[PDB]
């Protein structure tokens, strides 16, 4: 008569895209629409029991989260888990829920290893995955002739969820799985100056198509050092893997978009350097339903959660929890319509997988593996104004690259430079 | 009035050095001696509750084990946890017990990160640690003039507990922490022939003091390929990191000790090749108490556990659980003698730490970090007979290298070859 939904996310820390201050009201909106839909679980009263994935310091934990999962499992016996979004939180919890035969929904946990559904059984991801980033990079390399060598630089703060490592891991594995080109990689520490000589050296020795996963400032500093060292768009191209677009403002206002602008009297040199820089991000959903969702999300989050949801790409995560939860309810409704129960995790999960759905994020497709296809945007600066804008869009389901607003990919030489230099790298 | 000891180990798989078929009777021997000792917990009746660390396939698990820990914790509220021994089992469980403020004892979990007691609080290791291997290698390099460069080759079976990775991790980190010499490393797959050209190439390009963590057969094959390629003891020295001495028989009988003998008509070539090979292992405890312990262990294990405990270096692990359990009981006895309780994990742990103890394994020392100092032996072949024997012994506590039975380290050139070649590696 009622459905018990267990939640393991950061209930206090509001810094994560998947924080409860931001996923809570999104999920609240979803349950609210379930009530209004006579075609989604009629009569059922879906309840939620919460558990915090953060430890005593307030960051998501590889210990707090599994402990909270056990706690909710024996206290309430839920039919489905929601979250976590951190990789080190989700991995033990995922293995627990897979052992318990309980479905798991999260719009986080984008790491490669979560994709092993033979281990993470009944785990359905409705947000981005890092292999999908590899898919975008594969398509990019196929459409520009780069079929030899690329260099990947990535950095992480010590003690975090290692986001840039998992990003690069997914890109590395997938791209090498599909193209078998040499992908060189190098980790660095952002605050350590000893690595910048090393990195610049590696840049001009290991690749010409270069991907950097780092902070905005690290990528700016690297660009500034690359220009200072005579590395221009005629030979090098630097892709910043800024999937949440931290280096950009929101797509609602703040016209125009200048990631090289900092106000430190270096902005003139940074613009000239960023001529060789392009930014890869997730795609902002275009559909109006998304905009209406943000309006309601902001309203509810300020209302029953005392939080201010700001505009930005991070909001696709709570939108995907919302869409993911609705995708689940219909699956449960369809299972009940054929004599199943809410505990047939396999039947429910298979109903969600290999399926196209319409939610606030627009068209979303769950692949045969239980992971949402992820769309990406490619930003590029206009050589006239210097501001960055989307010039290329990647549909994750069709794997097609489509030009945006009749824009062209800016190249100082007219065409992309080769991924291998003239007479070798020497 | 009674002490509840929770145990999380492989209760069915008898393949691990820390299997219950091997640690069970060792621990039962320990409790049996606690009774006979009026100076250890008088009147208390120590009980044991068991949980298996292995999953449905029967290998130690990163899921079964933490689940079994929670299960025992809420069902019995123990005062101490025993095990697990696998690294991936012990890491989540250690973090659980650390959060619960419950002491943890294991003679396994040798991995580097378990040593971060700021995280794995109240975890006391009474068996070997892989940093302690770094300590032995450090003392070796200081005593033979190798202060520049060494190469480390390691391999693992896909899906295991990555033993050779954690061995190398501990060696790598500790040796670099103390000598700051270049330690190159390379992972390979044993079953993959494509790596043997690569490895031999790396051997003659990356180092001359070479450590290999692998199976006996992989190390034999590499030696045979190294001889076939003209790599002799005059320039190269190959250390096999065989801490449990799998490539050797037991120290009780089976005289003599020939790891190059295989019966495949390659034995004549393997002996000539193994002249450049030395084997690093844990040290067999000399004290008579150890031999009496093995006698009783074999008798009990065959009696109440239907298992046949065979002679070999692996038996130090259940001996160390036995000694660690006695170490704990005295700590608890001392805590109770000063008005504490059995739940003062901090007081009990600090009593065990930075302490010398006398057990079946002889003198054992818990360092300031809560990890047992580990003694190592260096095996070398006699150029007359070809059989291998201990020629060098490392006391982990005093960090001293002592010659064994007036033997000398065999060198084809009379002295060890330099860790750097003549006019560089080119």
């Amino acid at each position: 008569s009622d459905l018990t939904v267990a939640v393991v996310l950061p209930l206090t820390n509001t810094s994560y895209p998947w924080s409860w201050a931001r996923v809570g009201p999104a999920v609240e909106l979803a349950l609210a629409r379930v009530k209004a839909r006579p075609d989604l679980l009629p009569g059922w009263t879906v309840r939620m029991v919460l558990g915090s994935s953060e430890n005593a310091a307030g960051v998501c934990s590889d210990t707090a989260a599994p402990l909270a999962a056990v706690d909710l499992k024996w206290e309430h016996s839920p039919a489905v888990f929601l979250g976590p979004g951190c990789v080190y939180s989700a991995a033990p919890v995922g293995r627990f829920t897979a052992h318990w035969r309980v479905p798991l929904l999260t719009a986080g946990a984008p790491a490669l290893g979560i994709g092993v559904k033979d281990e993470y059984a009944l785990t359905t991801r409705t947000g981005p995955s890092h292999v999908k980033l590899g898919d975008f990079v594969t398509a990019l390399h196929r459409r520009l002739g780069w079929e030899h060598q690329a260099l990947v630089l990535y950095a992480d703060r010590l003690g975090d969820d290692r986001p840039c490592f998992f990003i690069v891991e997914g890109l590395y594995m997938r791209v090498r799985e599909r193209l078998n080109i040499t992908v060189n990689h190098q980790e660095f520490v952002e605050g350590d100056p000893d690595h910048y000589p090393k990195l610049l050296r590696a840049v001009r020795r290991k690749g010409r198509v270069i991907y950097i996963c780092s902070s905005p400032d690290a990528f700016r500093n690297l660009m500034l050092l690359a220009l200072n060292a005579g590395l221009t768009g005629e030979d090098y191209v630097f892709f910043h893997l800024d999937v949440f677009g931290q280096s950009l403002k929101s797509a609602q206002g703040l016209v125009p978009q200048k990631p090289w602008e900092r106000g430190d009297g270096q902005d003139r040199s940074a613009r000239q350097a960023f001529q060789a820089a392009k930014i890869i991000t997730y795609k902002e959903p275009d559909n109006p339903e998304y905009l209406e969702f943000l309006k309601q999300l902001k309203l509810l989050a300020d209302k029953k959660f005392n939080f201010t949801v700001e505009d930005g790409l991070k909001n696709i995560i709570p939108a995907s929890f919302h869409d993911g939860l609705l995708l689940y309810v219909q699956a449960v409704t369809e299972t009940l319509a054929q004599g199943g129960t809410v505990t047939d995790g396999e039947n429910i999960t298979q109903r969600m997988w290999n399926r196209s759905f319409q939610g606030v994020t627009g068209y979303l497709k769950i692949d045969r593996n239980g992971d949402r296809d992820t769309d990406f945007s490619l930003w590029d600066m206009d050589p006239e104004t210097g501001a960055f804008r989307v010039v290329l869009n990647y549909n994750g389901t069709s794997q097609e690259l489509m030009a945006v607003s009749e824009h062209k990919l800016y190249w100082p030489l007219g065409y992309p430079p080769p991924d291998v230099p003239k007479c070798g790298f020497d | 009035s009674d002490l509840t000891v929770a145990v999380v180990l492989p209760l069915t798989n008898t393949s691990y050095p820390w299997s219950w078929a091997r640690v069970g009777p060792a621990v039962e021997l320990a409790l049996a001696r606690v009774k006979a000792r009026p100076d250890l917990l008088p009147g208390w009746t120590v009980r044991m509750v068991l949980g298996s660390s292995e999953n449905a396939a029967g290998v130690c698990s990163d899921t079964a084990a933490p689940l079994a820990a929670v299960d025992l914790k809420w069902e019995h509220s123990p005062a101490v946890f025993l095990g697990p021994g696998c690294v991936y089992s012990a890491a989540p469980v250690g973090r659980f017990t650390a959060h619960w403020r419950v002491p943890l004892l294991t003679a396994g979990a040798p991995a580097l990160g378990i040593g971060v007691k700021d995280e794995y609080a109240l975890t006391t290791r009474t068996g070997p640690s892989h940093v302690k291997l770094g300590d032995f290698v450090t003392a070796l390099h200081r005593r033979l003039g190798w202060e520049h460069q060494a190469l480390v080759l390691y391999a693992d079976r896909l899906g295991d507990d990555r033993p050779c990775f954690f061995i190398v991790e501990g060696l790598y980190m500790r040796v670099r922490e103390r000598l700051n010499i270049t330690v190159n490393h390379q992972e390979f797959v044993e079953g993959d022939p494509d790596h043997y050209p690569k490895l031999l190439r790396a051997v003659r390009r990356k180092g001359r003091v070479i450590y290999i963590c692998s199976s006996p057969d992989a190390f034999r094959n590499l030696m045979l390929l190294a001889l076939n390629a003209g790599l002799t003891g005059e320039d190269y020295v190959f250390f096999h990191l065989d801490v449990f001495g799998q490539s050797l028989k037991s120290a009780q009988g089976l005289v003599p000790q020939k790891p190059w003998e295989r019966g495949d008509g390659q034995d004549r070539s393997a002996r000539q090749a193994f002249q450049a090979a030395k084997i690093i292992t844990y040290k067999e405890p000399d004290n008579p108490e150890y031999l009496e312990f093995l006698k009783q262990l074999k008798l009990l294990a065959d009696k109440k556990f239907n298992f046949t405990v065979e002679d070999g270096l692996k038996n130090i692990i259940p001996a160390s659980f036995h000694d660690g359990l006695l170490l704990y009981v005295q700590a608890v006895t001392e805590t109770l003698a000063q008005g504490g309780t059995v739940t003062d994990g901090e007081n009990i742990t600090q009593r065990m730490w930075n302490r010398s103890f006398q057990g079946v394994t002889g003198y054992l020392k818990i360092d300031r970090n809560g990890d047992r100092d580990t003694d190592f032996s260096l095996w070398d072949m006699d150029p007359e007979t070809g059989a291998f024997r201990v020629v060098l012994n490392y006391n982990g506590t005093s960090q001293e290298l002592m010659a064994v039975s007036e033997h000398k380290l065999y060198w084809p050139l009379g002295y060890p070859p330099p860790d750097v070649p003549k006019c560089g590696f080119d």
């Binding site: 590889d62 991995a91 690069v168 891991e169 980790e187 660095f188 | 890491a91 580097l112 991790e169 490393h185």
Partner: peptide, 23 residues
């Protein structure tokens, strides 16, 4: 891989050792 694909526990990320890192 030598560096990527090896489980998701912080115990296997204490040194890298398969990876190309400056730290």
């Amino acid at each position: 891989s030598s560096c990527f694909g090896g489980r998701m526990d912080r115990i296997g990320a204490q040194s890298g050792l398969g990876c190309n890192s400056f730290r």
